[PDB]
Amino acid sequence: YNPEKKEMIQEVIVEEDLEPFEASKETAEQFKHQHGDKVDIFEIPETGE
């Protein structure tokens, strides 16, 4: 804890689609459940990720 640098988080709306990242199956379904329409999740058929 450095009171000169007190960590908060601001909610922003993605004005334009993000660069994809890899998650586990479990963690991706967790993103899909939260975001609905506003996320796309696709199995990478080699890895399973």
């Binding site: 334009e16 689609d17 796309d40 696709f42």
Partner: protein, 72 residues
């Protein structure tokens, strides 16, 4: 080298990649300009693959209950 200890085990074309990255990114922006959805296809597919599994479950159930002989 710590896996090695426990089990007992002892011991050019990244330029063609960096172009295809650029082409991939260039494609994405043209798509975004054309209001074009390069996943719409695969999305609708995954959603139909679910309705099949669902109907195949209903139909596999009735074979369990009545038997092959009666359904044929």
């Amino acid at each position: 080298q710590k896996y090695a200890s426990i089990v007992g085990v002892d011991l050019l074309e990244e330029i063609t990649k960096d172009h295809k990255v650029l082409a991939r990114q260039q494609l994405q922006v043209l798509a975004r300009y054309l209001k074009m959805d390069l996943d719409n296809g695969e999305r609708k597919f995954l959603k139909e693959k679910d309705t099949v599994a669902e109907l195949q479950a209903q139909l596999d159930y009735l074979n369990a209950e009545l038997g092959e002989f009666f359904v044929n």
